[PDB]
Paper text:
We report a crystal structure of EGF4-7, where the domain interface formed between the non-Ca2+-binding domain, EGF6, and its preceding domain introduces a bent conformation to the region. Structures of two crystal forms (P21 and C2) were determined for [name] EGF4-7 using X-ray crystallography. Each domain within the construct displayed a canonical [name] fold, with a single Ca2+ bound, as expected, to EGF5 and EGF7 (Handford et al., 1991, Mayhew et al., 1992, Rees et al., 1988). An unusual tilt angle of ∼80°–90° was observed at the domain interface of EGF5 and EGF6 for both crystal forms resulting in a bent conformation for this stretch of [name] domains. The EGF5-6 domain interface is stabilized in this orientation by packing of the side chain of A208 (with some contribution of T209) in EGF5 with V239 from EGF6. A second packing interaction is also evident between Y219 and P221 at the N terminus of EGF6. These interactions are very different from the interdomain packing typically observed in cbEGF-cbEGF pairs, and [name]-cbEGF pairs, which involves a conserved aromatic residue located between the fifth and sixth cysteine in the N-terminal domain packing against residues on the major β hairpin of the C-terminal domain, resulting in a rod-shaped conformation (Cordle et al., 2008a, Downing et al., 1996, Hambleton et al., 2004, Smallridge et al., 2003). H210, which is located at the position of the conserved packing aromatic residue in EGF5, is instead involved in an intradomain interaction with H191 that helps to stabilize the loop containing A208. The EGF4-5 and EGF6-7 pairs adopt a more elongated conformation than observed for EGF5-EGF6, but these pairs are not as elongated as the previously determined structure for EGF11-13. In solution, the EGF5-6 interface is also observed to be bent but is somewhat more open (70° ± 2°) than the crystal structures.
The Notch receptor is a key component of a core metazoan signaling pathway activated by Delta/Serrate/Lag-2 ligands expressed on an adjacent cell. Notch signaling requires cell-surface expression of a hetero-dimeric transmembrane Notch receptor, which has a large extracellular portion rich in epidermal growth factor ([name])-like domains (36 in human [name] and Drosophila Notch). Key to understanding receptor function is structural knowledge of the large extracellular portion of Notch which contains multiple repeats of epidermal growth factor ([name])-like domains. Here we investigate the EGF4-13 region of human [name] ([name]) using a multidisciplinary approach.
Residue numbers in the entry:
A (entry chain A), B (entry chain A): 141 to 294
The structure:
């Protein structure tokens, strides 16, 4: 005799026997007789997304879409443009406003945040089937098993 | 026979014997026969203060006065307003521009960067010679040796 055998309480609801049937104790994220109805966290917890952010309800959670002036999962912290720095590949971040920034890239990279590595391979001198490998404003030839050299010619 | 006995080479210049006299080997910061003339680092090293900063020569060193857009001893890093945060006493920094900020103080503090602790002592109820001690939007009475209590009345 185990009415819970069937696993009726979903999404983490505890199942307990109750009279002829069972009974679900639901989690904070769901509700209903089986814990299969999503809780709208935005409506039950107003101001969940602080500092003017928009709350979007999800199934089993929610997400906050912050104003440009704030960040975090609930917009709790102000947005400081160059911390954490967005500029990848050792570029230099410079603030340009309250919510804006600008990246000064090292030679060899481009993009808004130094994200893309310029393809240095066109015009390479890798010979005898050696493959060209893009680098820090340069290239390297990966030679096949019967060649050595900077260009696979030795 | 020790011509250097007199300690003639100043500001860290090494003294060595040379002919009848001595001779000074000067440090980078000074020059002259005794290392007593200051070196003007600004003029001998141009661009010492990076990103448009002004170099002011000092005796035995120099100092850089940066543009608002940069910081460091030589203006090498850009200025990021809320990192390191200026707001003292657990206040919240909010950027308001490229080089400007604003602090949201916790209750009990005021000033541009939450620096001053509001004097909560006027109107205190510290009795029997007990001194008032300002606090986190509150006060405490430091009682004399024959009194106890929140107000020194027990
Ligand atoms: Ca939800
Ligand atoms: Ca490259
Ligand atoms: Ca100097
Ligand atoms: Ca106070």
């Amino acid at each position: 005799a185990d009415p819970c055998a069937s696993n009726p309480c979903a999404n983490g609801g505890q199942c307990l026997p109750f009279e002829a049937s069972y009974i679900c104790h639901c989690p904070p994220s769901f509700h209903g007789p089986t814990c299969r109805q999503d809780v709208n966290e935005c409506g039950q917890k107003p101001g969940l997304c602080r500092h003017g952010g928009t709350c979007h309800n999800e199934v089993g959670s929610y997400r906050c879409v912050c104003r440009a002036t704030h960040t975090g999962p609930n917009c709790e912290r102000p947005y400081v443009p160059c911390s954490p720095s967005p500029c990848q590949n050792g570029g230099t971040c410079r603030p340009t406003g309250d919510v804006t920034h600008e990246c000064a890239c090292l030679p060899g990279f481009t993009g808004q945040n130094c994200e893309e590595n310029i393809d240095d391979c066109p015009g390479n001198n890798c010979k005898n089937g050696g493959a060209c490998v893009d680098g820090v404003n340069t290239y390297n030839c990966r030679c096949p098993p019967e060649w050595t050299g900077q260009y696979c010619t030795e």
